[PDB]
Structures are given as structure tokens and as C-alpha cells.
Design an enzyme around this catalytic site. Structure first.
Site, PDB file in Angstrom:
ATOM      1  N   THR A 159       0.913  -3.260   4.399  1.00 57.16           N
ATOM      2  CA  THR A 159       0.935  -4.615   4.921  1.00 57.16           C
ATOM      3  C   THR A 159       0.739  -5.557   3.747  1.00 57.16           C
ATOM      4  O   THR A 159      -0.214  -5.396   2.980  1.00 57.16           O
ATOM      5  CB  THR A 159      -0.177  -4.851   5.948  1.00 57.16           C
ATOM      6  OG1 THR A 159      -0.062  -3.920   7.030  1.00 57.16           O
ATOM      7  CG2 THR A 159      -0.087  -6.270   6.496  1.00 57.16           C
ATOM      8  N   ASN A 161      -8.675   0.187  -0.471  1.00 51.45           N
ATOM      9  CA  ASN A 161      -8.260  -0.446  -1.722  1.00 51.45           C
ATOM     10  C   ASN A 161      -9.222  -0.127  -2.857  1.00 51.45           C
ATOM     11  O   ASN A 161      -8.794   0.071  -4.002  1.00 51.45           O
ATOM     12  CB  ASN A 161      -8.145  -1.961  -1.544  1.00 51.45           C
ATOM     13  CG  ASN A 161      -6.879  -2.362  -0.829  1.00 51.45           C
ATOM     14  OD1 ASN A 161      -5.832  -1.758  -1.026  1.00 51.45           O
ATOM     15  ND2 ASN A 161      -6.972  -3.375   0.024  1.00 51.45           N
ATOM     16  N   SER A 198       0.786  -1.234   0.000  1.00 48.21           N
ATOM     17  CA  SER A 198       0.000   0.000   0.000  1.00 48.21           C
ATOM     18  C   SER A 198       0.819   1.286   0.000  1.00 48.21           C
ATOM     19  O   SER A 198       0.221   2.365  -0.135  1.00 48.21           O
ATOM     20  CB  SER A 198      -0.952   0.020   1.197  1.00 48.21           C
ATOM     21  OG  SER A 198      -1.922  -1.009   1.059  1.00 48.21           O
ATOM     22  N   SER A 209      -5.946   3.737   3.623  1.00 45.74           N
ATOM     23  CA  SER A 209      -5.473   2.680   2.730  1.00 45.74           C
ATOM     24  C   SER A 209      -6.624   1.927   2.067  1.00 45.74           C
ATOM     25  O   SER A 209      -6.555   0.713   1.870  1.00 45.74           O
ATOM     26  CB  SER A 209      -4.549   1.710   3.463  1.00 45.74           C
ATOM     27  OG  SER A 209      -3.627   1.174   2.539  1.00 45.74           O
ATOM     28  N   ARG A 246       5.736  -5.556   6.041  1.00 52.90           N
ATOM     29  CA  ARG A 246       5.198  -4.427   6.798  1.00 52.90           C
ATOM     30  C   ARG A 246       6.060  -3.208   6.520  1.00 52.90           C
ATOM     31  O   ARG A 246       7.267  -3.236   6.789  1.00 52.90           O
ATOM     32  CB  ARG A 246       5.152  -4.738   8.292  1.00 52.90           C
ATOM     33  CG  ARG A 246       4.366  -3.713   9.107  1.00 52.90           C
ATOM     34  CD  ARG A 246       2.885  -3.799   8.795  1.00 52.90           C
ATOM     35  NE  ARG A 246       2.056  -3.127   9.793  1.00 52.90           N
ATOM     36  CZ  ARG A 246       1.194  -2.156   9.526  1.00 52.90           C
ATOM     37  NH1 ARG A 246       1.053  -1.676   8.301  1.00 52.90           N
ATOM     38  NH2 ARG A 246       0.452  -1.653  10.511  1.00 52.90           N
ATOM     39  N   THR A 257       1.559   3.630   5.431  1.00 48.95           N
ATOM     40  CA  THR A 257       1.879   2.259   5.801  1.00 48.95           C
ATOM     41  C   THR A 257       1.590   1.284   4.661  1.00 48.95           C
ATOM     42  O   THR A 257       0.893   1.586   3.689  1.00 48.95           O
ATOM     43  CB  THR A 257       1.068   1.823   7.026  1.00 48.95           C
ATOM     44  OG1 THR A 257      -0.326   2.027   6.759  1.00 48.95           O
ATOM     45  CG2 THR A 257       1.475   2.599   8.263  1.00 48.95           C
TER      46      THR A 257
HETATM   47  C1  LIG Z   1      -1.684  -2.177   1.831  1.00 49.13           C
HETATM   48  O1  LIG Z   1      -0.554  -2.421   2.236  1.00 49.13           O
HETATM   49  C2  LIG Z   1      -2.868  -3.064   2.160  1.00 49.13           C
HETATM   50  C3  LIG Z   1      -3.812  -2.289   3.061  1.00 49.13           C
HETATM   51  N1  LIG Z   1      -3.002  -1.283   3.708  1.00 49.13           N
HETATM   52  C4  LIG Z   1      -2.908  -1.472   5.007  1.00 49.13           C
HETATM   53  C5  LIG Z   1      -1.922  -0.709   5.751  1.00 49.13           C
HETATM   54  O2  LIG Z   1      -1.836   0.499   5.511  1.00 49.13           O
HETATM   55  O3  LIG Z   1      -1.181  -1.248   6.579  1.00 49.13           O
HETATM   56  C6  LIG Z   1      -3.782  -2.403   5.418  1.00 49.13           C
HETATM   57  S1  LIG Z   1      -4.241  -2.818   6.975  1.00 49.13           S
HETATM   58  C7  LIG Z   1      -5.849  -2.134   7.222  1.00 49.13           C
HETATM   59  C8  LIG Z   1      -5.705  -0.649   7.531  1.00 49.13           C
HETATM   60  N2  LIG Z   1      -5.811  -0.540   8.996  1.00 49.13           N
HETATM   61  C9  LIG Z   1      -6.769  -1.590   9.395  1.00 49.13           C
HETATM   62  C10 LIG Z   1      -6.539  -2.030  10.811  1.00 49.13           C
HETATM   63  O4  LIG Z   1      -5.538  -2.677  11.086  1.00 49.13           O
HETATM   64  N3  LIG Z   1      -7.457  -1.670  11.713  1.00 49.13           N
HETATM   65  C11 LIG Z   1      -8.842  -1.377  11.368  1.00 49.13           C
HETATM   66  C12 LIG Z   1      -7.145  -1.543  13.132  1.00 49.13           C
HETATM   67  C13 LIG Z   1      -6.537  -2.747   8.432  1.00 49.13           C
HETATM   68  C14 LIG Z   1      -4.408  -3.078   4.232  1.00 49.13           C
HETATM   69  C15 LIG Z   1      -4.076  -4.563   4.245  1.00 49.13           C
HETATM   70  C16 LIG Z   1      -3.544  -3.454   0.856  1.00 49.13           C
HETATM   71  C17 LIG Z   1      -2.520  -4.104  -0.058  1.00 49.13           C
HETATM   72  O5  LIG Z   1      -4.608  -4.376   1.112  1.00 49.13           O
END
Ligand SMILES: *C(=O)[C@@H]([C@@H]1NC(C(=O)O)=C(S[C@@H]2CN[C@H](C(=O)N(C)C)C2)[C@@H]1C)[C@@H](C)O
Ligand SMILES: *C(=O)[C@@H]([C@@H]1NC(C(=O)O)=C(S[C@@H]2CN[C@H](C(=O)N(C)C)C2)[C@@H]1C)[C@@H](C)O
Ligand SMILES: [Mg+2]
Lengths: 265, 266
Positions: free
Chosen positions: B214, B109, B46, B107, B220, B212
Site C-alpha cells: 500500500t 517496516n 512493500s 509487512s 495498492r 501486498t
Molecule cells: C507497504 O506497502 C507498506 C505497509 N505494507 C502494507 C501492506 O502490506 O499492504 C501496509 S498496510 C498494514 C498491514 N496491514 C494492516 C491493516 O490494514 N490492518 C491491521 C487490518 C496495515 C503498510 C502500509 C509500507 C510502505 O508502509
């Protein structure tokens, strides 16, 4: 249709040991349905939507600028201030950043930042009076305004007064066309309401709302919905001290289902 | 000296956490302050959503896009982790700026893929990287498959030094107008997804904004900027730790943050 509405809400009240105040009005403020509609309830965070309208009016009028930087220190961080805490090191949020955080995250510090700017709760009550609301009143900043002491008339509204205020802001010309559209989008994009009223509405309705949670079991949701190409303003205030937080969420969603039944018939 | 301590502390984290840590820190002109595995490829996941927003802002800056233009979509644009996209679905659209802010700060999608649709897909993202002097970063797929992070797969990758220099170009190198640069800086500061990653490792008085990521197989990441001791920096951190828990990977990136702190403060 209206007797079923009343009976179904009374059943929720009985089985959940709850009080439920509801008002639905059309864009002119005319009553569609209601329950305990002129009983006073603590506003809690729902007032942040009228606060943003106040802010939008001052920008509309040239009395405020949306990008004006509002400086603060750590003293402004109070419980549940996620954006305020993120912007703390930078030293400010803008008027519009703070308003969007107050509406969409229910950020308390951002709310209080704006309250400091307008001169405190009396100015917000003054705005209610300007738009024709003689009932709603703000007396305190966050979080103590959400104390919800039984019988306290401070920091209260009624379902019908708040629903008519929602209608005035969105449909009754309180804001410019552009500002009205913006606040409408902010309500649709609210991040805190996924489990409350919109969880009980049909998924094709266009819905925007502002939630509230107070002490002593308050759980509220106010806003608008477009159903079958018709526009409505709605205010829901509930008190359920014996329920869990998740069950209070489910209660407001259940009220959303009762509203759906009335609208669809 | 302090660079050697920086290397030594990161390798300590790598051994103890069964991880690989890619870091690059540059000054506003892109000159290297310090780094680790700087030329190693990592999946961007992301983190590319920050360059994507810069791409969009440049089109607004140039008059080829309008921030309030409505991007219509239906249910088929909702994918995993599309919170704003889901909320706006009934209304029928998300504006250009609404989608970009959701992509950066949540983030989201679906919002990312909505913008990719408008710009021409991953090829247009890669073209923007090349335009601003980044010969390394490449976007090949939309979300969420671009975060597959198959080992050795070169698709959807960057290097820490390439993307730290892309960050510095966007924030400090004149890629955006003064107004758009300040806006994207504020969006990074206000990011809602980074409270437990790099920011958790920096001192409370540093001004920090980041994006960020993931991904699968233990990725990460966290890229962005920080302002410390009256000095400005761009930073890119990419980590791979397949045997750590999700919370442990947040702690890993926060620990990298305090290793960076120890470096900058001496
Ligand atoms: C990108 O890396 C993926 C999405 N981006 C992120 C991220 O920025 O880490 C996430 S995690 C998503 C955002 N915050 C949420 C959380 O942990 N809480 C609600 C507490 C979950 C996605 C996975 C993309 C490739 O999917
Ligand atoms: C306002 O009523 C209070 C704050 N407003 C709300 C609310 O609107 O629901 C909350 S709860 C807040 C929103 N969702 C967050 C959450 O549950 N998690 C992230 C775990 C917390 C506040 C209580 C104001 C008077 O404090
Ligand atoms: Mg202070």
C-alpha cells in the site's frame, strides 16, 4: 505491599463486578503474591502455551518432527482460525506452523490440528501431570472448551497451578535450552496481547504472554516478565460478564498496573 | 482470444474505477502468459519485502548469514507500522529470520529497515535484483519514505513483467535451495495482510501466496504465485487508484484476481 495489592484488586472486583485470580511466582515456583490463587477458572485459550510446550517436548524427545505435514480439510476450520484458513488450499500445516499459530494468533483450528495428533484432551491433561501439575485439566477441544459454564470444573486451572506450570516450562527444565528460548520468543512475539497485561507493565520489562477470551466474560493472560533483572511467572484469570470486550481488556491491563506496584516495592 | 477478453475486462475496471492496472503473469520459466501495462513503472512499496527475504535466504544458503543471528536495535528503529519490532524492542533484538518473517507476513517496516541496515541499504537490494537477472527493479530508500509514490518518480519502482519474472526466478528458477524455496513459499501462503486482495478474487481451491503493498497517492499492489489446474504461475499486480477508498482499492485488486481467474480457466 501485599495488603495494598489485595485491596487494589478488591476495588477492581467491586467496581467492575468481576472476579480476579492472580498468582506471581519466582523461577522456582515460590509465591511472590496472589489473589484467589487456588480458585478454579476456565483456561480458555491460555492452555495453548502448555500445548506448545508438549509439542516441543515431543520434538525434543524424537517422538515428533517440527516439519511434519499435518493434512486437513475444511472440517477443521472453526471460529477464529485465521492461519488454518490461509493454509487450507495447500492442504496442511506443519507441526511447528500449527504450534506457532496457536500461540501467537490463538488459532483454534491449528490448536485442534495438534490435539487430533496427540489423541485429544486426555493427552494434554497427561502432559500437565508429567510436569507436576495435578490441577490443570483439558476435557474438550476448541471452541467448546471455552464455554465457561458457571461452576463447571472441566477445562479449568488455578492461577497458582498455571503460574507454576509456566515457571516449570520456562525456568524448571521441562524443555531443552533451545526449545525454551524458542517458546520464550514466541510469547514475546504474541500478536494478541497488546491491550492486556503488557499494556499495564513498564515498557522496559521483557514480557511474553498468552491471552484467553471465553464466554460469560472470561479474560485471561499468562506468561512471564523480567523486571529489574529478576524473572517471574504470572497467571491472571478474570471473569467480568457485565463489561464490554474493550473494558475486559482494560481490566487485565489494570491488573498489570497493580502487579507493577507490588513488584516495584 | 482469451487474452483479448483479459485486456478488455481490465480496461473496464480502469475506466470505472479511475485506475491504472499493471499485471504480468508468467510460467515458471518466465514466459509471458498474459499482461497489461507490463512495461509501465509502478512504485513497489512493500512488495519488495519478498525479494528482500529471498536476498536474506540466499546469504543463509551461501553461509554468509545465520538465521538465528541476533540483530540488536533501539527505539530509533521503530517507524510507522512496526508491530513485531515494537513487541521485541524491550528484549533488545530480533533474529535475522524473525525480522524477515515479520517483513513478509506482517509487512513490518521496522523489521524491513533492520534487515536493510544489515545488508548495506537500498544499494544492496538493487544489486540482488541485478544478480538474479532483473535489470529494472530498483530500491533507493528505506521505509516508509520509499512508498511516497510521487507520479513519474523513478525511485523505488519496478514493472509488472520485471517483478513477475523476479518472482518466478526466486520460486522456480533455482535462486534458492530446495529448503529455502519451500520456506519462502510457505511464508507467502501464510501472509497475514492479503485476505482482501488477490486471494479474495481466486477460487478457494487454488494454492496462493503473495505479498501486498500500500502506498501514498492510491497505490495498492500484490505479487506472488498461484497453483491452478495442476499448473504453476508467478504474478505481479500493481494498481494506482487515487480517488478510491482504502477498502475500494482492496476490492479493485480482488477484482483483478477474478479477471485473472477468468483468463486462466479458459
Ligand atoms: C507497504 O506497502 C507498506 C505497509 N505494507 C502494507 C501492506 O502490506 O499492504 C501496509 S498496510 C498494514 C498491514 N496491514 C494492516 C491493516 O490494514 N490492518 C491491521 C487490518 C496495515 C503498510 C502500509 C509500507 C510502505 O508502509
Ligand atoms: C481463546 O481464549 C479463544 C480465542 N483466543 C482469543 C484471545 O486469545 O484473545 C480470542 S480473541 C482473538 C484474538 N484477537 C482477535 C481480535 O480481537 N480481532 C482480530 C478482531 C480475536 C479467541 C476468542 C478461543 C477459545 O476461541
Ligand atoms: Mg473436511
Amino acid at each position: 505491599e501485599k495488603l495494598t495489592f489485595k485491596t487494589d484488586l478488591e476495588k477492581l472486583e467491586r467496581e467492575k463486578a468481576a472476579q480476579i485470580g492472580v498468582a506471581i511466582v519466582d523461577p522456582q515456583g515460590e509465591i511472590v503474591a496472589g489473589h484467589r490463587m487456588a480458585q478454579r477458572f476456565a483456561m480458555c485459550s491460555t492452555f495453548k502455551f502448555p500445548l506448545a510446550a508438549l509439542v516441543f517436548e515431543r520434538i525434543d524427545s524424537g517422538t515428533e518432527r517440527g516439519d511434519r505435514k499435518l493434512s486437513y480439510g475444511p472440517d477443521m476450520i472453526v471460529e477464529w482460525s485465521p492461519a488454518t484458513e490461509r493454509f487450507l488450499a495447500s492442504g496442511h500445516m506443519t507441526v511447528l506452523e500449527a504450534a506457532q499459530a496457536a500461540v501467537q494468533l490463538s488459532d483454534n483450528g491449528a490448536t485442534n490440528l495438534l490435539l487430533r495428533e496427540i489423541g485429544g484432551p486426555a493427552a494434554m491433561t497427561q502432559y500437565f501431570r508429567k510436569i507436576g501439575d495435578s490441577v490443570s485439566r483439558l476435557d474438550r477441544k476448541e471452541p467448546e472448551m471455552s464455554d465457561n459454564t458457571p461452576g463447571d470444573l472441566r477445562d479449568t486451572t488455578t492461577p497458582i497451578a498455571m503460574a507454576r506450570t509456566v515457571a516449570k516450562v520456562l525456568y524448571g527444565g521441562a524443555l531443552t535450552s533451545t526449545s525454551t528460548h524458542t517458546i520464550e520468543r514466541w510469547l514475546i512475539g504474541n500478536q494478541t496481547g497488546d491491550a492486556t497485561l503488557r499494556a499495564g507493565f513498564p515498557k522496559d520489562w521483557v514480557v511474553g504472554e498468552k491471552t484467553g477470551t471465553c464466554a460469560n466474560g472470561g479474560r485471561n493472560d499468562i506468561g512471564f516478565f523480567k523486571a529489574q533483572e529478576r524473572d517471574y511467572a504470572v497467571a491472571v484469570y478474570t471473569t467480568a460478564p457485565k463489561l464490554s470486550a474493550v473494558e475486559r481488556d482494560e481490566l487485565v491491563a489494570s491488573v498489570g498496573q497493580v502487579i507493577t506496584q507490588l513488584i516495584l516495592s
